[PDB]
Write a structure and sequence with these properties.
This is Phosphatidylinositol 4,5-bisphosphate 3-kinase catalytic subunit gamma isoform. Pfam families: PI3_PI4_kinase, PI3K_C2, PI3K_rbd, PI3Ka, PIK3CG_ABD. Belongs to the PI3/PI4-kinase family. It comes from Homo sapiens (Human). The protein is α+β, with helices and mostly antiparallel strands. It has five domains: 157 residues, Phosphatidylinositol 3-kinase Catalytic Subunit, Chain A, domain 1 (Ubiquitin-like (UB roll), Roll), CATH 3.10.20; 137 residues, Immunoglobulin-like (Sandwich); 190 residues, Serine Threonine Protein Phosphatase 5, Tetratricopeptide repeat; 154 residues, Phosphatidylinositol 3-kinase Catalytic Subunit, Chain A, domain 4 (2-Layer Sandwich); 190 residues, Phosphatidylinositol 3-/4-kinase, catalytic domain (Phosphatidylinositol 3-kinase Catalytic Subunit, Chain A, Domain 5). It is built from 31 helices and 25 strands. The strands form five sheets. Strands 16, 17, 18, 19, 20, 21 and 22 form a seven-stranded antiparallel beta sheet that branches. Helix 15 packs antiparallel against helix 16. Bound molecules: the ligand C[C@H](Nc1ncnc(N)c1C#N)c1nc2ccc(F)cc2c(C(=O)N2CCNCC2)c1-c1ccccc1.
Length: 840
């Protein structure tokens, strides 16, 4: 009976039915809330297409993949059992069109993977194909029986506005079970990051109990409280310093004004725009944490719901405002203009964030007018999707549901490919929702239930935060529960196996790490533990979390290692469970405790967004954003990139443990890995592109100044950065004399390959700059939701500079070409300084 819930709790990693840490019924309301959305998508989804989850795209096939074709000819090696016949096919052939061509019912599965080439889309539009064309590989499929939908079967089942009183809250006091100066409470009525009204208590002495018994009357009227308003209660000591915070929605999920006695356990601060500050969750640590005691009282329920001509100077002023970037602050004058010309502004979708930031949300008549304005949103509805613009409306500056819902409206038009690109940060954006049940929450729910791949990643992203965010685990747990109740028994069993496996592996990771105080004569224990796991405890096979097409099989005990590191990560290799796998390659997974890999997920995901941006300008910069999933507290997994070594090690081989750093070694290493000259210059060009990619991407992100035992290269020239969570003079990025000699330059010269590198960099850079807004917002979101450390205005404003906002294109070329030159001017000075730093 309720054994199903026990399953779901183990899958979720948090007890959703628990009510030990609630002061209302919002979470439970949201479970019931999501039942319909879950049922509606579960009932409406095509069961066969959900069983095979064809991964496809409507983006045009890029130039770089077109130029790799032999005139409407892609070869597809089909497999029965023994041999395999090849078939010339047009890029535009549907998989049906190929099946009747081969027959000269069944379906084509990719060899070694849970991936199918099925559906009414041309074969150029399946990702697996575009992947094979990119890396220069042959397309191997198998004539297979379709999977039964049965396997996916789902186990079935007084007006606030008539109230002119000033709002007020009684502060009874604070109590802390264990703590020498004074302390006061600051009560804020918030909407977004905007403080509407503020009041303080008198300072009393900071004893383990402090009582005030004071009515704080606010300047705002009850009628003027907008939905999603937050009573943010804060505690300072003293000169002042913030010690604790908690929040409480003043208008609840049923539109009722919040009333009665509350005892709210509070969050502490580390020794600032952090998403965690926004949460409505209270601290679950009742025993240790500070708490505050309040009383709301007056049942009051909130009701549900000009010409456009102007002077020339004002039109220009307003257009100038509408044009500035998302982090340019609006002045009082700017806001007043936007709002007066409300309806002119409404015609420009790009005005929307700014205009909805010009709304006085603490004034009921103005919010009414704002809603009348959202009634007139034809142009918004008609505009082509700008994700950049849409993401801004979903960030911390917008707490109003109707405003936010129009963002989620635009997201509905995203094809499944693009939801995958933005899914991590859409899931992170749930952190900005005032309520647990939101348009965004349901959007993620339904897109996830509509598609096994979004669903798969949705699970791990949500679970990532449920395992290590007390601030948001409750909300996300509710959402994930909603998902698991509609994903199908097949996936429930998949997910179950994966969690079982990663818990086994993380334990071994944690235990091996305990047995070392940097080397290892006890790689004995590791191999011993892995043998014990593989004997009746680890399953025959499991889906690889960061690449769900791949199923892993038996471990390769002999190939598994621990690193001569401080954090002793594991290096695990598995046999692919799929007998149809044509490769011999193992599946390689690193397990690391010690870094916050949520930071790594975000940077790696932004790198993908960059790649996708580049694809729109027909540029490929061969970035290698390897798989990475954060699975728990300072713990996670990383996709092992095969045939790859660090730059440091290439230097340690032809020099030693010293900074002697020869300019020549990398090219030497490359030359000795390339078998032919055909592949060497291919390697070298692959490296010019890689290097350019990572110089630009890392510069824009402000993570370009790196230790070179944290930059790797494949044996085919593909450079890539690693260890992003690891983050006296500096440098823009890493373009060292070793890299420059592969490009055929030295000290103060130029070359064919180097001139290209600049040519590629400048294109790439200016390319990202065409999506300035999108990047600025993802960067702000990234910091706010994933780096508690780095969330001051100054931190967030780094990317304005790096993307040379306001500058013309030609001037931006001159900026970056200078950045490049700063590296030429520094050579090994920083690298060397890193050696002296990171080795003494
Ligand atoms: C630094 C490198 N990191 C990566 N390697 C491959 N794919 C990746 N995605 C990463 C990352 N991040 C690495 N990680 C290890 C993790 C666990 C472990 F037990 C050993 C690791 C090792 C490591 O020292 N090894 C010893 C040499 N054989 C490879 C494994 C490396 C590493 C690999 C090549 C060159 C230098 C170092």
């Amino acid at each position: 009976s309720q054994a199903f819930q026990r399953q779901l709790t183990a899958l979720i990693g948090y007890d959703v039915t628990d009510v030990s840490n609630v002061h209302d019924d919002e979470l439970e309301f949201t479970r019931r809330g999501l039942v319909t959305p879950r049922m509606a998508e579960v009932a409406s989804r095509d069961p066969k297409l959900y069983a095979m989850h064809p991964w496809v795209t409507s983006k045009p096939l890029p130039e770089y993949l077109w130029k790799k074709i032999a005139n409407n000819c892609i070869f597809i090696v089909i497999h029965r059992s023994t041999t395999s016949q090849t078939i010339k096919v047009s890029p535009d052939d549907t998989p049906g069109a190929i099946l009747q061509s081969f027959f000269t019912d069944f379906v084509l599965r990719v060899c070694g993977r849970d991936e199918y080439l099925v559906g009414e889309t041309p074969i150029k539009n399946f990702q697996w194909v575009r992947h094979c064309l990119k890396n220069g590989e042959e397309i191997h499929v198998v004539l297979d029986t379709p999977p039964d939908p049965a396997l996916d079967e789902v186990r079935k089942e007084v007006s606030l506005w008539d109230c002119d009183r000033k709002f007020r809250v009684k502060i009874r006091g604070i109590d802390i079970p264990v703590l020498d100066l004074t302390v006061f409470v600051e009560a804020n009525i918030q909407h977004g990051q905007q403080v509407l009204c503020q009041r303080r208590t008198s300072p009393k002495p900071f004893t383990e109990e402090v009582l005030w018994n004071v009515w704080l009357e606010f300047s705002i009227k009850i009628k003027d409280l907008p939905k999603g308003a937050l009573l943010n209660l804060q505690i300072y000591c003293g000169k002042v310093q913030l010690l604790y915070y908690v929040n409480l929605l003043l208008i609840d999920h049923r539109f009722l004004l919040r009333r009665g006695e509350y005892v709210l356990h509070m969050w502490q601060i580390s020794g600032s725009f952090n998403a965690d500050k926004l949460t409505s969750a209270t601290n679950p640590d009742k025993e240790n944490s500070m708490s505050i005691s309040i009383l709301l009282d007056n049942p009051i329920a909130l009701p549900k719901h000009v010409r456009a001509e102007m002077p020339n100077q004002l039109r220009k002023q307003l257009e100038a405002i509408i044009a500035t970037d998302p982090l340019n602050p609006l002045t009082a004058e700017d806001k007043e203009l936007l709002w007066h010309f409300r309806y002119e502004s409404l015609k420009h979708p790009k005005a929307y964030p700014k205009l909805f930031s010009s709304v006085k949300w603490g004034q009921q008549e103005i919010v009414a007018k704002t809603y009348q304005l959202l009634a007139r949103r034809e142009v918004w509805d008609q505009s082509a999707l700008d994700v950049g613009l849409t993401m801004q409306l979903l960030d911390c500056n917008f707490s109003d549901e109707n405003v936010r819902a129009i963002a989620v409206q635009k997201l509905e038009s995203l094809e499944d490919d693009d939801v995958l690109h933005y899914l991590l940060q859409l899931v992170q954006a749930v952190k900005f929702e005032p309520y647990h049940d939101s348009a965004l929450a349901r959007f993620l729910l339904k897109r996830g239930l509509r598609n096994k791949r979004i669903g798969h990643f949705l699970f791990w992203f949500l679970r990532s935060e449920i395992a290590q965010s007390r601030h948001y685990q409750q909300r996300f747990a509710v959402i994930l529960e909603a998902y698991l109740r509609g994903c199908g028994t097949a996936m429930l069993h998949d997910f179950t196996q994966q969690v079982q496996v990663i818990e086994m592996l993380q334990k071994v990771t944690l235990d091996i790490k305990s047995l070392s105080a940097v080397s290892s004569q006890v790689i004995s224990q590791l191999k011993q533990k892995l043998e014990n796991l593989q004997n009746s405890q680890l399953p025959e096979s499991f889906r690889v979390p960061y690449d769900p097409g791949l199923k892993a099989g038996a471990l390769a005990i002999e190939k598994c290692k621990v690193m001569a590191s401080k954090k002793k990560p594991l290096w695990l290799e598995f046999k692919c469970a799929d007998p149809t796998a044509l490769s011999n390659e193992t599946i390689g997974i690193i397990f690391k405790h010690g870094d916050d890999l949520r930071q790594d997920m975000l940077i790696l995901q932004i790198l993908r967004i960059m790649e996708s941006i580049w694809e729109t300008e027909s540029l490929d910069l061969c970035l290698l954003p390897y798989g990475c999933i954060s699975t728990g507290d300072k713990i996670g997994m990383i996709e092992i990139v095969k045939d790859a070594t660090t730059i440091a090690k290439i230097q340690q081989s032809t020099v030693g443990n010293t900074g002697a750093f020869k300019d020549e070694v990398l090219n030497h290493w490359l030359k000795e890995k390339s078998p032919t000259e055909e592949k060497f210059q291919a390697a070298v060009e692959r490296f010019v592109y890689s290097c350019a990619g990572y110089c630009v991407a890392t510069f824009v992100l402000g993570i370009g100044d790196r230790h070179n035992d944290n930059i790797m290269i494949t044996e085919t020239g593909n450079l890539f950065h690693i260890d992003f969570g690891h983050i006296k003079e500096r440098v823009p990025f890493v373009l060292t004399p070793d890299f420059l000699f592969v490009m055929g330059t030295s000290g103060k010269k130029t070359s064919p390959h180097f001139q290209k590198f600049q040519d590629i960099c400048v294109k790439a850079y200016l390319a990202l700059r065409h999506h300035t807004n999108l990047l600025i917002i993802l960067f702000s979101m990234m910091l706010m939701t994933g780096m508690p450390q780095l969330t001051s205005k100054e931190d967030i404003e780094y990317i304005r500079d790096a993307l040379t906002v306001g500058k013309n294109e030609e001037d931006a070329k001159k900026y970056f070409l200078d950045q490049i030159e700063v590296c030429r001017d520094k050579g090994w000075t920083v690298q060397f300084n890193w050696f002296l730093h990171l080795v003494l």
